Amino acid sequence: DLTPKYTVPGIEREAAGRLIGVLRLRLHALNDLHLTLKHVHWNVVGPHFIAVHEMIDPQVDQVRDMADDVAERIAALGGVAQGTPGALVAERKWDDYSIGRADAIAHLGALDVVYTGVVEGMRAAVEEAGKIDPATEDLLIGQLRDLEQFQWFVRAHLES
Amino acid sequence: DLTPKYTVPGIEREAAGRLIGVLRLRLHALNDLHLTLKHVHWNVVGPHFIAVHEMIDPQVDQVRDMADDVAERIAALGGVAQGTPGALVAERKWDDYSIGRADAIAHLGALDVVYTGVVEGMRAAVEEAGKIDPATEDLLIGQLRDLEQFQWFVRAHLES
Amino acid sequence: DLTPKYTVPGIEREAAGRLIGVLRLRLHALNDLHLTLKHVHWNVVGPHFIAVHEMIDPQVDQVRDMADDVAERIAALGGVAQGTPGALVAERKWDDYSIGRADAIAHLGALDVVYTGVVEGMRAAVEEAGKIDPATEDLLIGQLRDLEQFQWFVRAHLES
Amino acid sequence: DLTPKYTVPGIEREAAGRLIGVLRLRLHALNDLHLTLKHVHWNVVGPHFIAVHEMIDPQVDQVRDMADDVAERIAALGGVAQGTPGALVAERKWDDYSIGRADAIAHLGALDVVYTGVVEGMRAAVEEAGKIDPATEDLLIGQLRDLEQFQWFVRAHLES
Amino acid sequence: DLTPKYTVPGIEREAAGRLIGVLRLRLHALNDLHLTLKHVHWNVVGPHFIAVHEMIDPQVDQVRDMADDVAERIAALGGVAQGTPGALVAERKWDDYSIGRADAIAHLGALDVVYTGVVEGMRAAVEEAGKIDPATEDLLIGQLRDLEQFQWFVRAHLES
Amino acid sequence: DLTPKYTVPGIEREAAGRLIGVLRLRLHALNDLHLTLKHVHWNVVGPHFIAVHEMIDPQVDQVRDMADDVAERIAALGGVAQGTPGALVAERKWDDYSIGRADAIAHLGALDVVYTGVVEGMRAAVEEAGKIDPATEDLLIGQLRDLEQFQWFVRAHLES
Amino acid sequence: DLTPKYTVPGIEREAAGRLIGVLRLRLHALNDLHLTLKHVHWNVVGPHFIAVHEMIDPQVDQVRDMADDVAERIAALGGVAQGTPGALVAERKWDDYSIGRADAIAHLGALDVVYTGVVEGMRAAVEEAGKIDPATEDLLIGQLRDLEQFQWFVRAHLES
Amino acid sequence: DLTPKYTVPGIEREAAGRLIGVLRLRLHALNDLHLTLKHVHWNVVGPHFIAVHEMIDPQVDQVRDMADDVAERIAALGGVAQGTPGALVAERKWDDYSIGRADAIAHLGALDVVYTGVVEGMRAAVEEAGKIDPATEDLLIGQLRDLEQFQWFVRAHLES
Amino acid sequence: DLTPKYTVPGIEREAAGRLIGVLRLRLHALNDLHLTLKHVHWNVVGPHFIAVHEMIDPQVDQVRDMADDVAERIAALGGVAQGTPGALVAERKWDDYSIGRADAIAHLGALDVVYTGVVEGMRAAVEEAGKIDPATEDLLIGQLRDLEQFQWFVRAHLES
Amino acid sequence: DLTPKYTVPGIEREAAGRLIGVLRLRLHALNDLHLTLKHVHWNVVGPHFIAVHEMIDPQVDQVRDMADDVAERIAALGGVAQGTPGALVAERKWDDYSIGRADAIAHLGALDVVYTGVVEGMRAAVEEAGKIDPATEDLLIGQLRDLEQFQWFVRAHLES
Amino acid sequence: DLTPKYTVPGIEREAAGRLIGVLRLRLHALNDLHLTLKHVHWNVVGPHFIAVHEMIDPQVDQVRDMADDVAERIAALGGVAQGTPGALVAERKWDDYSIGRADAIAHLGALDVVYTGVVEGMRAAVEEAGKIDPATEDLLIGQLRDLEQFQWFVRAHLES
Amino acid sequence: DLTPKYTVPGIEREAAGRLIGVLRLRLHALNDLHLTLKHVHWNVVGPHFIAVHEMIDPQVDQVRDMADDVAERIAALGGVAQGTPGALVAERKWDDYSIGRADAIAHLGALDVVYTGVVEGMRAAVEEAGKIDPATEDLLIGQLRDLEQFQWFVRAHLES
Q1: What is the C-alpha R_g of chain K?
Q2: Minimal CA separation from B44 to chain I, in Å
Q3: What is the CA G64 to chain-centroid distance, rounded?
């Protein structure tokens, strides 16, 4: 189904097709996450907005880099790294981020929930990739730890 | 309707609400454009793919910067700079980019059509902004010229 | 009166003298604005002072650069770019910024009022310059948009 | 005549052909100007030559960049950005710069006259472009202001 | 009178209030000095103006940094670092710099007199601070030596 | 007792031994201070934690540099710059910083008390060094002023 | 006991509490290691001291970075990253580094023994973390390899 | 046989000797790979040679860095990191790259076959190292993924 | 005829005049070459245009630097480094580059012929300079080798 | 035999073929030299190994750059720049470097002998190239002097 | 005698003349010191020469900077900063450094004696300047501490 | 006499001893030249002193680099690179630079005479080295051309 014509040496094509499907959905989640982080950066107001900007800037740049790395891994395995928004909205398993112009507590509380979905999805993908290819598993594990640390910074703000 | 509670000094609120609606749709177009440029970068293959990468890299970074500048202008005028993909897909007036894994001619021919839509949309927005606020018109005119030049690089490849 | 002995090619001397008077007062406003921004940076205290520092630092550097560009434009047109404080206090049409040691809300609320005066003054100068010389009008329009965006960051803090 | 086969979206081909002719002559003037500035840098002597070097260095680099931007605009509009010296000498409407080895006053006095021709030519091109395409007009207006400021530095030396 | 509510550990409040008054007037002098240096940079003409620009550029940047350091020292001691021009003009003990558009000799001769006032004021402040707090005395002594060296560069030009 | 076998030229060995003892305890205080600043950075939570991070980062780097400079001065004088934690805990004259996971007010209030101890200790060391060696006194005076300024930033947050 | 109130998504609280205890002791070991490396840098003498400086400089900077990463991981898991020296001395399972002023062979021989303890401790922590959370295991494995390589550089000096 | 006299703490000497043999052959493969990549860079001609240069440059630099990291790991484990060409030619299990001066398709087709051998060899080494030492396995897994991605760029060119 | 009034120490004036004539024509050739390279960069189209841009960019910058070095050598020898286009067109011994908007093969084939003329001219100048002054011969020999290497990159594209 | 189909302008094909043979063997020697320098860097141990690392690092980078320059010169002349190890071992006129894990004196003594062979080979190549083409002779002479200076640093260590 | 015509404000001319004489001899000592440090760098051989290079490089650059600062202070005070070697040899109160080609112990032992003379001379100059001008005293005290620290690095090598 | 015990491969010891004597005197001339350039920088006054500073700064840095390169060449050949001022004054064949505090014309006129001596000395050394070793001749020829160009900048100021 997503089975490629050829793939990376040492991986069977059928197994690569299943890894491609796992990475395709992680790529959707990372693309939706950096769109959401920018949305938060643009629409946060109130006395903590500078702190949200300072926190989110480096996360947006790092999440965009994660997406590039997962996409190029898809391509290497023989798949299509689908990056268009129509496809993302058609295939995702979560709803649009719903906060508009709002203070930091409102945005950060909602972004914490966004990150729970992302990190749980990545933790499931790590388990599936670990059975098919340790190079892709290793890629996902480093990104999972960075995403959990970005979530911790969001949570630390909400603590007390 | 999009009329803000307050806006930039010297601009009437009702006129700001109309400028907000114009910039909201330009922001959708710029967000869809950098998602599309990344999609092309990830999925171009064949003997010209390195040239497409070299052309598209700086365009992705510059288009992401244009989106930030239009979004912060929306925010300053009193509007919501909507950056989520569900809203973009619900409000846009064009279809998803449709090329998957493909050679440079296929991608560049389709990206040329994408850019015609963007530059015509920006040229219309320049005319509307010029009647409401010269600072926003000046922002859009500099971005229009850069987008047309990015389109020229795409077209030059297809020439002959 | 401010009519120069010679001016930039293509501009009449009498019209240049009127543009010189418009830019002389904008230069006073920009000089008073960066003195005021430094005053705020030095005297803000309380739990948001780091956020005020982070916001104001880049504004001070950019406003100092705007002043240099308006001054060199005055010089090119044949006028004196008057930068001394005695003259600024004698010719300005606004009062000294009045907040001493104080928290962010007090400073930012007063700085918002300062910026309304600056941006309204710049918007009036844009209209006058547009009738005399499009190169000077274009200079002022780019600075107006940056000043309005700096005002938005001040306002966003006070929102809610 | 200079009418292109196709041009930037939203501009009629016949109007683009006239804008191409206007930009072609501005490109000749900018190319002759940076050749002339280098000639001055290489052949100025006497007790002010270090000051002429310091003034002219950044102008040469900026004028070379202006030429690239006008040339790429010509190309985008569908025209030939003609950069060879035989064509420049055949089409220009001014004479060769005539000062050889000479002191700063001699060179700067002649370069001031060169710049009057350039800035008047650019001011005329701005008016023509403003009727055909605001993106090209905006390009030329920013270059005009920088050229007038470079002329002011040349004039300031000769003042007294 | 300027006695603070609290001050740096190890310094008595009454003595801190007197040190605050000494630093407040030095801050006025440094603020007026960088406004004056910019005024000179903007309004110097004639065959030595490039040399004045090259000399004054680094002095303006360094004097602005000195002002920040004295202001933050005032703040640490418990005082208001007053940076507005109305207050500077009301409290200063010298007149406005009086040279408009003029050649280097005119400006440099007047700036030399400005610096004599600044360096004598700083030398008096060093003596007063040395009796109250060696950390503030050490700050002022490093700035005094840099200011005297900037004065030497101004004087060297006028020598012969 | 701490009397070295040889020391810097121009200083008597017995006096160097007393200066070594003074610097050894200042080195303990600086080492405990950067360990404490890192502890605060790692364990601050709540809506001001980003501001505490931004404040403490540069202080940690600068305090680590102060420790290196005092240690190398000890070494030059002929002493052992003791940097291990067992020795620091055995020789220090203050208790462990006691705040765990906590908001900015809790940490900053405790860090202010830490800095009072450090700056009073440094002010006493300056007086002792000034009697033995002006080069070591000058080192300590520059560090004292920076530490007091770092304390002011901590205090400014707690003001109101 | 160290069981947190909440932890990273996908990890049980009780298991997180055990991982927190493992990382708390690794953080003590890394903090004691960079204090020890600085102690060696400050107190090495003799004809190989420049080589010890060149070797230890980058290790100190990298070990300080490892400590930050383990501490922020503790914080994300819900624990206290304890960084104070009293606690480190109370909880560690090794003695203070015991070499004072000494040549490279003496220091490097003792530092080799220090590193054996650190790398064995890290190898045990990797095994425990691998059973609880692959993201924390992956963090520790990259640090283990760098620490073993730093130990090799220390050993290579002592070889022959 | 390759059993070292001593090795990294926590690894048995006999097992280290087997890991040394595995890494010795991977080092030969990486050394032959960067020699081969340079050979391709120097001898590619035809209309795609600039694209091959742009692709291969960063690969040569990264492969040279991989070789350094594997060699230093060998050294740490107690082995000889053999880097001379006589030994590489005597011990390798593949033939010399055979393409001389040739177009991109010829070189890239042959380099794809080279990379299949390298990545299969690295995937086998990962499995062997994973049984002996997770730090060396982790090193090899990150290099495997980068090598497979470099192979994908070579393959993408040949696609269609 | 081109005999200078004075020249570099150790060179006879008459011989310097002949070296000046040789360098004057090489300066014309280098000036026409960088004008031609820019012309090619601006007017190349088709599927290889990005590769031509990447090749020509560094050549334009390096050829402009060669021209500066030959011009300053002319000046040092006592001659006029003539840089204006009227003089270049009057004195050159080759025709204007004749390709307008065209694909890479057309431009590169013509640029190869341009470079043959330049490198043969430089090789003749090296022989003449070698008889008059080894410092000028050494300057020309380094530029000849770089020009031949730039020609090789142009030729490599056309190979097959 | 190595006679190329075409070569650099101004050089006869038969003479180019002989220069190609001379440069082909120098390229082998430079390739074997940087492989050997890396081998030494990886396998030096004992109390001077940091000094050998510091000496050899810059030599490896510079020797790799020399190889690129000789290879591109071969290519320009019409030859194959052979970079594979099988060919190097088949064509070289010296034996493999024979020192494994060893102290600095052992490695440096052997590397000195390696460099004698390289510099004598380069000095012979300079004489042959000087008869065929001064641009290639000039390339080799600059590399010879750098290689002799690298040999001096190796020898200086062994002196006494 | 060295009494200047005018001097820095606030210093009597006769006292300035005595300070000029003190700084003139310190400038000789700093000039002779950086000539001597270069001499050592160029002529050290044996197994520690790389360590001497690494130590002396930064000292040469810093000592050259000290000389510039003392010279510009002399100039500001109204004196001649004498930098020629004939004058240095005629006025100095020490002999030429006497070690030629030699190992590190020989050079470092002699350089230690050189530094004792420099630091004792600087300590005497600090005492004399402290009575005339605190700005010059402060300059000399910072340089004294850096020179003593450079001496410590030389001594540390000789320790044991 | 200056015959070394051993020298660079391929050069006879007796010939090396004569080349060492030639380079020893060139090193004296370069050392005296950068001491003289600093002397001029420190003691130039009057309305052109900023221009002299701007000209001389880069020359001092480049002449110091030339001295290092000649000294390391002496060392490689087996000689002593003598850098002390007593030896320079004893062996030089020219007098001390004689201008004290003076305007640019006085200094530049004298520095022009200094450079004539240096460049004539270097031109003689080039001829002698060319007979013994082309690598040393090539070093001296590049330095000669840079020195002549530095002399041209000094002369250009004095022209008219």
Answers
A1: 17
A2: 14
A3: 9
User: Would you call K31 an interface residue with chain F, using a CB distance cutoff of 8 Å?
Assistant: no
Distance between CA atoms of residues F64 and F31, nearest Å: 7
Q: What are L45's two structure tokens? A: 């006054």
Q: Do B45 and H104 touch (CB under 8 A)?
A: no
3-state secondary structure chain B: CCCCCCCCCCCCHHHHHHHHHHHHHHHHHHHHHHHHHHHHHHHECCCCHHHHHHHHHHHHHHHHHHHHHHHHHHHHHCCCCCCCHHHHHHHCCCCCCCCCCECHHHHHHHHHHHHHHHHHHHHHHHHHHHCCCHHHHHHHHHHHHHHHHHHHHHHHHHCC
Alpha-carbon gap, residue A101 to G41, rounded angstroms: 53
Look-up of token digits 């909201």: B24
Which of I8, I136, I138 has the CB atom closest to L142's CB atom? I138
Whether F54 has its CB under 8 Å from any CB of chain C: the answer is: yes
Test A95 with B86 for CB contact under 8 angstroms. yes
Q: DSSP labels for H26-40?
A: HHHHHHHHHHHHHHH
Q: Please give the resolution of this entry in Å, rounded to 1 decimal.
A: 1.9
Q: Is the CB of residue A80 less than 8 Å from the CB of residue H159? A: no
Nearest chain L residue to J138 by CA distance is: L138
What is the rounded CA–CA span in Å between residue G19 and residue F159?
A: 39
Which residues, in sequence order, are bridge partners of residue B44? Answer: B102
The residues, ordered by sequence, that sit 6+ positions from E61 with a Cβ below 8 Å of its Cβ are none
Which H positions 116-135 lie with beta carbon below 8 A of chain G? 134-135
Q: Quickly list H helices, chain A.
A: 13-43, 49-77, 85-91, 104-130, 134-158
Structural domains of chain H, count: 1
Nearest CA in chain H to G122: H10
Confirm if K36 and K92 have CB atoms less than 8 A apart. Answer: no
> Using the beta-carbon criterion (under 8 Å), do C119 and B8 form an inter-chain contact?
yes
Contact J122, J140 (CB under 8 A): yes
Tokens of J19: 């220069």
Terminal Cα-to-Cα distance of chain E (whole angstroms): 49
Cβ neighbour number for residue L113 with a 10 Å cutoff: 11
Could you list the beta-strand ranges (E) of E60-130: none
Helix and strand counts by DSSP (H, E) for chain J: 5, 0
Burial class (CB in 10 A: 0-12, 13-18, 19+), A91: exposed
Query: B40: domain range?
Result: 1-160
Q: Name the amino acid, one letter, at E68.
A: D
Question: What dihedral do alpha carbons E106, E111, E117, E118 form, nearest 10°?
Answer: 180
Q: Residue B102 forms beta bridges with which residues? A: B44
Question: What sign for the dihedral angle of Cα B35, B39, B42, B48?
Answer: negative
Cβ–Cβ under 8 Å, residues F147 and F111: no
Which residues in chain D are closer than 8 Å to L51, comparing Cβ atoms? Answer: 47-48, 50-51
What tokens appear for B111 in the block?
């990206």
Residue D138 C-alpha, separation from nearest chain E C-alpha, in angstroms: 27
Q: How near does any CA of chain I get to the CA of L78, in Å?
A: 27
Q: Which of F50, F32, F47 is nearest to F89 (CA)?
A: F32
For residues E82 and E159, the answer to whether their CB atoms sit within 8 Å is no
What are A44's strand-pairing partners? A102
DSSP string, G90-124: HH-SSPPP---SB-HHHHHHHHHHHHHHHHHHHHH
Q: How far is D85 from chain I (nearest CA, A)?
A: 6
The CATH number covering residue J31 comes to 1.20.1260.10
Q: Residue G102 forms beta bridges with which residues? A: G44
Question: DSSP assignment of L24-56, as one string?
Answer: HHHHHHHHHHHHHHHHHHHHB-STTHHHHHHHH
Compute and round to an integer the Cα radius of gyration of chain D. Answer: 17
Cβ(A57)–Cβ(A90) under 8 Å? Answer: no
Rounded distance between C-alpha atoms, residue F18 and residue F29, angstroms: 17
Question: How far is it, in rounded angstroms, from Cα C108 to Cα F106?
Answer: 26
Q: Given phi > 0 = left and psi -120 to 50 = alpha, else beta, which region is L78?
A: left
Record the tokens describing residue C23, joined without a space.
Answer: 């830019």
